[PDB]
Amino acid sequence: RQDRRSLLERNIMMFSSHLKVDEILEVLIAKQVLNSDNGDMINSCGTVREKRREIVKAVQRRGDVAFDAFYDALRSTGHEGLAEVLEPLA
Amino acid sequence: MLCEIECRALSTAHTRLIHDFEPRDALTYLEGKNIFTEDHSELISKMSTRLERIANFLRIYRRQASELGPLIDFFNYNNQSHLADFLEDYIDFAINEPIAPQFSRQMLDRKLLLGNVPKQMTCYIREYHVDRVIKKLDEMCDLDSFFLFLHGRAGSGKSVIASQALSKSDQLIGINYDSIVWLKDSGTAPKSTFDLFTDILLMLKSEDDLLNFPSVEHVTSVVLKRMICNALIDRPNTLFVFDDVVQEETIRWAQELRLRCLVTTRDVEISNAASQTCEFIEVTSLEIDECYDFLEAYGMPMPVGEKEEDVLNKTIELSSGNPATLMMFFKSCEPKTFEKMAQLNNKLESRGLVGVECITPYSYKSLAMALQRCVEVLSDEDRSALAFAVVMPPGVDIPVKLWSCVIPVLDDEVADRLKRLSKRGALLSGKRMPVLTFKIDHIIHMFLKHVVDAQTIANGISILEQRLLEIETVIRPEDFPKFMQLHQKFYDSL
Amino acid sequence: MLCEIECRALSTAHTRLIHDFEPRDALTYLEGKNIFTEDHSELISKMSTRLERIANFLRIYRRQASELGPLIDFFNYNNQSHLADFLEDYIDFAINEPDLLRPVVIAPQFSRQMLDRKLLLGNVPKQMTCYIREYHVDRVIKKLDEMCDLDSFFLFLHGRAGSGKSVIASQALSKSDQLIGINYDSIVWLKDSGTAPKSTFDLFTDILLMLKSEDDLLNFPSVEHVTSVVLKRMICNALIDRPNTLFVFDDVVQEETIRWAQELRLRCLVTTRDVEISNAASQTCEFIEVTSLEIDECYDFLEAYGMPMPVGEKEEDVLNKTIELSSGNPATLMMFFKSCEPKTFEKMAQLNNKLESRGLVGVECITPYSYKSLAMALQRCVEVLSDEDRSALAFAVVMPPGVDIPVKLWSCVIPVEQLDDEVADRLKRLSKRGALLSGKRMPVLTFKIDHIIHMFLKHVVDAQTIANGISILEQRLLEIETVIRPEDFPKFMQLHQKFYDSL
Ligand SMILES: Nc1ncnc2c1ncn2[C@@H]1O[C@H](COP(=O)(O)OP(=O)(O)OP(=O)(O)O)[C@@H](O)[C@H]1O
Ligand SMILES: Nc1ncnc2c1ncn2[C@@H]1O[C@H](COP(=O)(O)OP(=O)(O)OP(=O)(O)O)[C@@H](O)[C@H]1O
Ligand SMILES: [Mg+2]
Ligand SMILES: [Mg+2]
């Protein structure tokens, strides 16, 4: 929705500063929020801003309730991210 | 949407946004900031050349944003800060505060021409008038629609002054009004007031689609009128000179079309057609001093002897400061000798205006060709009154009753006709006190005389002697009307 | 298709849809939601300027959609939400909360210059400024405001010839900034003056033109030849694009023309002289009569145009003479001024004479009136008259003007058992139809002829028929002021010997 997406957009710098969609594909797909093909397509992207744009869209759709993902930046040592988005979520 | 200011900036800083920039770079930052719709970024993102992506980014952008802040924002982050700095500087030299002359002239010249304005007279200008015209036009560029009546005697020089008043100052065209449309009327038929406005619209018409000009020749008045206003909306501050209006219908149309009009005319009353208060400027007979100036200006020798300044006061007397007939005089005084100047003085009498009729910048060989019309238009009853004014001495202030003697029909009715008569061609000279008196000048006098029935002159003279029975600056007293004999001199010459 | 509310919105919010919008942006979204055809998008998609793509998008759109919904949905998605928000606000101040639309969502969008654009294009003339009839221009505007709600209606601004009706419509649509923009979206002001039977069709040929876009005046066909059923059907079709459009029909003479207006379900202001043309409309007709200028209003009107004010007993009287003869006639009063060039009470009284010994022709002048003198106008008012009524009028000259006089006293000069009420019936038709007569029910049924209405007849009717009517009355005179001439004293019309000897 507008709140969730507005969050993926507001916290765009950090996501598009560090972060990597390859890192989340195995998890998100493990959560069934992603498809093998989805991961494959993203996995096969030359630059990261490409792999990032895709995931954001995917999250805004497939993972509208990216709550699960909100526990992913936790596990990935990128907790300074999942903490910011929980603030937005809050 | 960016305002003129904000759009004038994207345009001024355009030589730069072409040398180093790219709309693909900004699309993500705009879509991300909810500034670009998917299709927007598609449209600007798939473009072969960059001048395409740039022209679409600057077109699409000017519509979408409530302001210019985001543009600067992006220009910064993109290492193109030398750009976002220039634009922020420009927005500030407006937010915090409230060329070649000859080259510029060409624009003025073109404006004058395309509006079919003729060239202004140069060898001699009655500044006063040209000045006062321009002034009263400046006062009105504010107004939504208005009439200016530059009226005067036939050939008194009105049209030349409009040529000059729109040609001297560089403000009237460009500063006060955007464009000029100058159309000569001269309409007498009833189809003329429509034909005029057929050609007015043409002036407005683009250079394109003069080819497509239809058989507009056949289409109602309600439509030519509606058609014109449509085109009128396109042009702002469009001044209209209507050189030579005779029919009040022109004024009427001018007022249905909510036009801004300069108007040269001879008959002043056409203004009663317009309910709106109309301003007026009368082109008087050339004052005695202005006549000198006008003569010198065109190589004419100034007085040297008592009976030489007099030879020249004779021409001025006969011409009564008449621009047009004065000019005809010069074109004839080839010897340029006080002598051949006096030959004409005498000749003009024993032949009326026809003695000096010549090829002149005037459409007319002689002032008699002009006045013809001024006389045809006259009320059938008024055409009569004018015919009997010949008997009276010209250049003499004379009572109403002394006139009641020759004029057909309390005889105030005579006065009413004589007013209509000065109002409608400056044929007569009114003058309220000391006592209600009129006067006929020589130009007009000679004209009427030579024009009428050789009989009606002599009949009016006799019809006067009858009333002579009763029972100079100093107007003629009622104890001494019995003798019009003071002017025996100016009467025996019949 | 939509309607007047949904189309009035696309029109009100038009100053905006021009500054930021593009029909190319919406074509894909509408070929989709089932509102467009692949020629539709072709027609609006290949257009050089945007005002073209916009005028075609708003024309084509008003026909295609069952409602105004996807549009709102669109300006939302297109980052032009400041638009879809304005239009949804407007659609809401109509269904739920009525009334509030004009004060709230329409009033702010006023601008004097806009009116002038709209006035000029609707062929409205400029309003008189040097004097304004307060009362009337006000009451006109009022009764127009009360009706912007109505779907179709007639307003009859009826009065005597030159009585000043047309000028008031110029002012009533030019003073307030609401009538145009707030109450009605556009104006169409057309002068009728139709007498031929082709005139009522020719009128409506121009009405459609007055409607048609600046584009396709080129394509204007030989519409000159096409049935009445089609010009009529052809007009309403375009009318769609015209929400809250008002119609001034300056100078209707024909009731047939009156009709068409009611087949076309139009909203009409109507200036006319003959009031009965309204019987053509079964629709409720509301009326405003332009009376003769009251004695006080005449003063105001004179001063307004540099006319001196009475200074002496027999100077206020010099001026009561003009007002009497003029009987407060805007048009002939104006002709007076344009002629009263000296402006001196003296030359003002000179004319007061010229008027008795030359009728209206003594003061005929070039005036903002299409007419040299009020006689040129009244000509028509008299031609139209029932052949029998033309007769009745023609004999009224004998009667004293500005005198309240009984029906029987009239039965004496007027043509035609024992009850002559037929005289009264003619005299009513006579005031109804150009207002050439006065009427007064009680104390007793009496009529009256004014002076402007009198001098005209005096100078026009057969010099003989005047003298024949004078002799006729004498025979009937034999019989056996505020107070109506009593029946004990009719035998002597001699009270008015003064105003009778002058014949
Ligand atoms: N410098 C001048 N200023 C004024 N009049 C001039 C001047 N030079 C010449 N004239 C005379 O006036 C003629 C044109 O007169 P003009 O057209 O100004 O009068 P007008 O008021 O237009 O007359 P009309 O009544 O025909 O409209 C010239 O060709 C010449 O005869
Ligand atoms: N308020 C006014 N101010 C100035 N002049 C007026 C006014 N009202 C009427 N007149 C005079 O009447 C003339 C036009 O009259 P108007 O058209 O208003 O009357 P009307 O009732 O339309 O007559 P008709 O029905 O014949 O059109 C103007 O030229 C002016 O002389
Ligand atoms: Mg000229
Ligand atoms: Mg009118």
Residue numbers in the entry:
A (entry chain C): 3 to 92
B (entry chain B): 1 to 98, 106 to 416, 426 to 487, 521 to 543
C (entry chain A): 1 to 416, 424 to 487, 521 to 543
Please quote the authors directly.
In Caenorhabditis elegans (C. elegans), onset of programmed cell death is marked with the activation of CED-3, a process that requires assembly of the CED-4 apoptosome. CED-3 is synthesized as an inactive zymogen; its activation requires association with the CED-4 apoptosome. Activated CED-3 forms a holoenzyme with the CED-4 apoptosome to cleave a wide range of substrates, leading to irreversible cell death. Here, we report cryo-EM structures of the CED-4 apoptosome and three distinct CED-4/CED-3 complexes that mimic different activation stages for CED-3.
We thereby assembled the ternary complex of CED-4/CED-3_CARD/CED-3 catalytic domain, hereafter referred to as the holoenzyme, to mimic the full-length CED-4/CED-3 complex (orange). In the presence of the catalytic domain of CED-3, more than half of CED-4, 52.1% existed as octamers. The octameric CED-4 is nearly identical to that in the crystal structure, with the eight CARDs observing a group I stacking. The ring-like density on the top of the CED-4 apoptosome can be assigned with four CED-3 CARDs. Overall, the tower is of ∼120 Å tall and ∼170 Å wide at the bottom. Basic residues on CED-3, including Arg7, Arg63, and Arg64 appeared to contact the acidic residues on CED-4 CARD, including Asp20, Asn78, and Asn79 (cyan rectangle). Compared with WT CED-3 CARD, less R7D co-migrated with CED-4, whereas R63A/R64A no longer associated with CED-4. In contrast, neither CED-3 R7D nor CED-3 R63A/R64A responded to CED-4 apoptosome, supporting an essential role of the CARD–CARD interaction in CED-3 activation (lane 4–6). However, in the structure of the holoenzyme and the CED-4/CED-3_CARD complex, four CED-3 CARDs were resolved.
